[PDB]
Design a protein around this ligand. Structure first.
Ligand SMILES: Nc1ncnc2c1ncn2[C@@H]1O[C@H](COP(=O)(O)OP(=O)(O)OP(=O)(O)O)[C@@H](O)[C@H]1O
Ligand SMILES: Nc1ncnc2c1ncn2[C@@H]1O[C@H](COP(=O)(O)OP(=O)(O)OP(=O)(O)O)[C@@H](O)[C@H]1O
Ligand SMILES: [Zn+2]
Ligand SMILES: [Zn+2]
Lengths: 605, 611
């Protein structure tokens, strides 16, 4: 099929000249666009007469209803939009599209050529006729007889511009999406354009394409491929040092990934604890709220408080309260609600069912209660904002305690792994007790559960070594002293063993220099880990005891580690996403969620 | 800095009027684009007089030497080429590029606009003149006095087409790269186009950009991010099944990766064996070349021959010959040549230095000689074709309990790991850990504790019947980071998931597996005994394709790759590329070697057919 589209100005003979472009083969369909000016009407009648005879191919004539003459740029946009829609409707297939720029204003020809290039056409040409017509033999043919004489005299010279590929994202635009109004009055189609949507869409597509092309070169220093579409100015802003104050709003909206969160350390004090206590099912076994004053300077302690004091800080919650089913469900729902506030797109809550199991509530019942509460809280949230939650069972050894709880927790995890396969699942076991525990963990690996190793109040480099190799771990928690063995900072980096760093937890437990101008020997080891290839993440540890969320941790990473580029923050998020204990469906959903990185709003300095 | 570029035609009053778009501001310099037609010479003289009587900003006139008048399309392409080059020479920066396209023909203005959009322009504007001039008071300005009175009377209604930001790969071009030759004739510069290299440059840039944008949506599915510049037809081609017959050349052209290539079976038979033998430093000490008839149909046996027989096929070479330094050097040089002839961008040759020791030659000396031979071979090759080769030491689990060689190999590996830090290096060990319920993978007994202690890697050789227990004992007790011939992995649905999650690569050898275990060939669908390549790939495992023993298997890396299309029905080309990328990513290289390998991998050879 061949459809020929041309615009006619003051001369109507252009269409007949182009009619014989390919010769006797002809064009199956011909469409002509013309202005509404009265001076064009005589040409319209002449062309109607010329079309009645030579009635071989189908014919139709289109006039721009709202355009008469070129007077300014507004009519410019008007006829540009009208021409775009007219060509879209009349030539749905680019391969069958032939266009001639002889007719219309010079700007009309330029705009039509631009439209062809942007949307594609089979061929573009301009028809020039010998001016051996009319009186004195010095004018172009302007009558039916003159046009016919020109056609049979081989006097038409065709300037074929060759194929025009079109544009990738704009080769599919169709008239139905951007319909054009046509009013029929005789044999002439009167065309009017409703809105400017198409031009705005084209401009946006072109701007996005140019941004993508500009950023295409460095497609490996961007953690997320979707960052390519970002404007070059935004990308340059991205690599600058992270400012803890001006970036609070942006870092608030990042879809984050929380991999180290304790369920028992969420509402240890404050209004959250009061809510948990009020939602209790049996408001008679609740222990008195013990007074546990916070250290001065909280949440930024003046000096470290050691691990033991840190744990003792949250003594109003946990096992000594969560044994009431109402309190447990209230705690779970409040934790999920707090997760939804920071736009956390994925989390792995760490819970210990045994600490909450009573005589009449076996640990399996408590774990099922928690899992189903979380599955509920997920199911009352739209998937476009849902925060998937997977559970980790903390199997912590007791200093002088009983291994019976460890057996309880390993068996519970092994059973929960197989029981559930959709929604909130049990992904792995956390070892908040690491020393070797080798044969105690052979069953866990045999069924394929992940294991994370929880380092706490420690300064040893053999614990980190035996975690990696004896009880094969896939994530190390709080391993702040790992460069002290240059042999292991090269196996953790080569085996992809993620290191979960908690800024506030590690600062409050131990304390590090803050907002230092230059890195020294006491600064936070985050950047040293990053530059060595380590998959270092950032988390919150205990949301309650630490008294701050993931956003605060990411923001204070700047003060703790000087000169950290927010691109490093995105790298940490991607590392967490790659380190999570997800499966194909959850992993794909998480990755689709991460691609929506919020745009900056103060990239002007 | 503000500049103006405009072509001129039969109406010479166009450039003067256009020069007042900024009005009283003026422009730093305006250049005139002109053709060789003689109908515009009076206009050129009028413009020269106007410039002389209106001094200040620099002025120039350029006439198209080869374009006298518009007759055919060739003049049009020449005009566009001249426009592009002249704009580059006079408008290297688009921030000061202002365009007025009043002059010329209809196609001249369209070419002006296309060039402006392609290379960007700060302002593109057109001039409309109110007809009030001439003797009849109806024509437009055509003389110097008419131009001046039109300017003063304000008969100009300029139109601004908007800014042209440009094109990312075409806004950085500089004039000197594509110089413009011009002949001076008084005040008018006579430009000339040396060639149309610029047009081809622009066309290539636009085509590559179109390919990038078309395949952009879905770059996460491309094994190599550099494939986004491939034509969409080629991207469709990649997603089709592989063909063993037509795809010989394309596979031969891939920059591949080798990870399972034993040095003791490279020249076990034939011309290579003779080349090795005649290189011995002690020709009279060479063991007699025995008779080792190959089974019929080799390298495609009509029935499986067994691991014992397969191993025995390599008697002519190995410990029999390689004790001689000359034979060792010949082996190394020929192996490197065989690698280069197959376009391998990274290899890990596993040797057994202790097996080649003598009374006067300690295992360390043999290892040093091998490493230095490979380093020399690497040094003489241009860096574009240099196949970075690392070494893996083999701790064979020979029956009987002999641990002298195993201990020696582990100690030698721990020593070489630090002795060398550039070029060819020792990167790990490849514990065989045989099957017979007495060695398995629990042979650890602290034997492999030191190798882990120093940061070395381990790669097991799951034998000819390990049965899921070996593949677990090795993964979870030896901390193996690769597994060889893990063909029964599908048995336990838990191992096929632990391997996928932990990212443990699986090394497969199509030809060796076919010749030893035997598999259905040329099948239409996938049955119980179908080769597990596609099964492993589906589950997410990181499967890699290698050669095992070059000499014994008598098939190079390309032969192994093409045999998958016969072993695994429906295997596609994109999956071959995915296997190459997995092999590259699962190798024991460091940052420098990995970066070189990744730079070498991006150069995928374009298909010869496309359909
Ligand atoms: N920040 C922390 N780092 C390491 N271990 C912690 C931390 N906070 C608590 N733990 C220990 O981890 C295990 C689980 O703690 P969780 O936060 O779930 O509270 P819990 O067990 O209910 O608290 P409690 O110590 O008051 O009985 C317990 O052994 C707890 O002592
Ligand atoms: N496909 C294979 N499967 C298992 N073991 C193998 C295989 N190929 C070689 N081996 C064993 O691994 C080692 C191979 O190393 P290499 O060939 O360099 O030494 P070699 O002593 O010269 O070998 P060979 O006995 O083959 O001549 C030898 O122990 C060989 O027995
Ligand atoms: Zn913790
Ligand atoms: Zn092997």
């Amino acid at each position: 099929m061949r459809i020929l589209l041309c615009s006619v100005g003051t001369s109507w003979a252009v269409v007949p000249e182009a009619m014989q472009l390919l010769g006797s083969q002809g064009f199956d369909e011909v469409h002509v666009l013309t202005t509404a000016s009265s001076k064009i009407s005589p040409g319209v009648e002449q062309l109607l007469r010329y079309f009645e005879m030579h009635p071989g191919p189908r014919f139709s004539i289109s006039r721009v209803q709202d355009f008469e003459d070129l007077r300014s740029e507004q009519d410019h946009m008007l006829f540009e939009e009208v021409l775009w829609r007219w060509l879209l409707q009349r030539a749905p297939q680019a391969a069958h599209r032939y266009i001639c720029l002889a007719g219309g204003y010079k700007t009309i020809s330029a705009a039509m050529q631009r439209a062809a290039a942007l949307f594609g056409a089979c061929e573009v040409f301009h028809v020039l006729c010998e001016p051996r017509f009319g009186p004195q033999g010095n004018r172009e043919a302007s009558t039916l007889e003159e046009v016919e004489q020109a056609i049979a005299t081989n006097a038409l010279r065709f300037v074929r511009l060759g194929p025009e590929p079109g544009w990738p994202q704009l080769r599919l635009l169709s008239a139905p999406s951007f319909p054009l109004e046509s009013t029929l009055q005789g044999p002439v189609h009167w065309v009017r354009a409703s809105d400017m949507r198409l031009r705005q869409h084209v401009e946006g597509v072109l701007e996005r394409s140019r941004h993508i092309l500009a950023a295409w070169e460095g497609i490996s220093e961007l953690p997320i491929p979707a960052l390519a579409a970002w404007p070059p100015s935004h990308l340059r802003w991205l690599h600058e040092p992270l400012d803890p104050v001006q970036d609070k709003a942006w870092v608030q909206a990042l879809p984050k990934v929380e991999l180290h969160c304790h369920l028992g350390g969420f509402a240890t004090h404050g209004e959250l604890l009061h809510k948990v206590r009020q939602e209790a099912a049996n408001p008679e076994s609740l222990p008195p709220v013990r007074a546990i004053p916070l250290p001065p300077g909280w949440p930024i302690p003046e000096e470290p408080i050691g691990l033991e004091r840190y744990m003792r800080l949250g003594d109003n919650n946990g096992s000594a309260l969560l044994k009431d089913p109402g309190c447990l469900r209230a705690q779970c729902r409040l934790l999920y609600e707090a997760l939804l506030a920071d736009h956390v797109a994925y989390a792995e809550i760490r819970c210990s069912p045994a600490n909450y199991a009573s005589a009449s509530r076996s640990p399996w019942v408590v774990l099922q209660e928690i899992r189903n509460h979380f599955q509920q809280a997920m199911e009352e949230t739209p998937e476009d904002r849902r925060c998937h939650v997977n559970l980790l069972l903390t199997a912590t050894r007791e200093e002088g305690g009983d291994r019976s709880r460890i057996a309880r927790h390993l068996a519970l995890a092994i059973t929960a792994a197989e029981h559930w396969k959709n929604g909130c699942r049990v992904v792995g076991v956390d070892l908040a007790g690491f020393a070797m525990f080798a044969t105690d963990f052979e069953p866990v690996h045999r069924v394929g559960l992940a294991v994370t190793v929880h380092a706490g109040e420690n300064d040893d480099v053999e614990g980190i070594w035996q975690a990696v190799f004896k009880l094969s771990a896939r994530r190390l928690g709080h391993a702040l002293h790992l460069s002290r063995s240059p042999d292991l900072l090269r196996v953790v980096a080569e085996r992809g063993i993620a290191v979960e760093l908690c800024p506030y937890a590690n600062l409050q437990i131990k304390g590090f220099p803050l907002d230092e101008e230059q890195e020294g020997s006491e600064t936070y080891p985050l950047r040293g880990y990053l530059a060595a290839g380590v998959a270092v993440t950032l988390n919150t540890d205990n949301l309650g005891i630490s008294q701050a969320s993931l956003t605060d941790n990411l923001l204070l990473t700047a003060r703790l580690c000087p000169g950290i580029t927010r691109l490093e923050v995105l790298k940490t998020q991607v590392f967490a996403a790659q380190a999570a204990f997800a499966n194909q469906a959850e992993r794909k959903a998480l990755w689709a969620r991460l691609a929506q990185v919020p745009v900056p709003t103060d990239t002007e300095q």
